[PDB]
Copies of this chain bind each other. A is one copy, B any other.
Amino acid sequence: KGSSGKRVIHIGLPELSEEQLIEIGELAQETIIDYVFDHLTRSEVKDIEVTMRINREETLDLEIEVYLEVPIFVKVDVDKLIDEAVERAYEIVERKLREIAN
């Protein structure tokens, strides 16, 4: 089992139309996916799992859970890579939200 790691980006959501809700969810997830494959070659990625989660209780919450695993012979720092991927996702979603707020 090569290096692996998981992270969950969690975002409280404001008032959004259905179209904007789906757009935001997909944006968050694709930013993470694209980030991974813009730094790794398809061969270095043994397993990538991504879950989009939208929970609506007292508050509207979006969560993107990502798990990544590389071959045991690949030397990339998976945790740091996932961290940065997730960070990029947070800022891109947070900006898109401010933009919508107008």
Contact = CB atoms under 8 A, between A and B. Distances in A.
Interface of A: 17-19, 21-22, 25-26, 29-30, 33-34, 37-38, 42-43, 45-58, 65
Given A18-B37, A19-B42, A50 B52 contact: yes
A54 B69 CA distance: 11
Contact of A22 (B17, B34, B51): B34
B37 A21 contact: yes
The 8 closest A-B pairs by CB, nearest first: A18-B42, A51-B51, A47-B55, A49-B53, A48-B54, A18-B37, A50-B52, A49-B51
Q: Determine chain A's interface SS by DSSP, over half rule.
A: mixed
A55 B50 contact: no
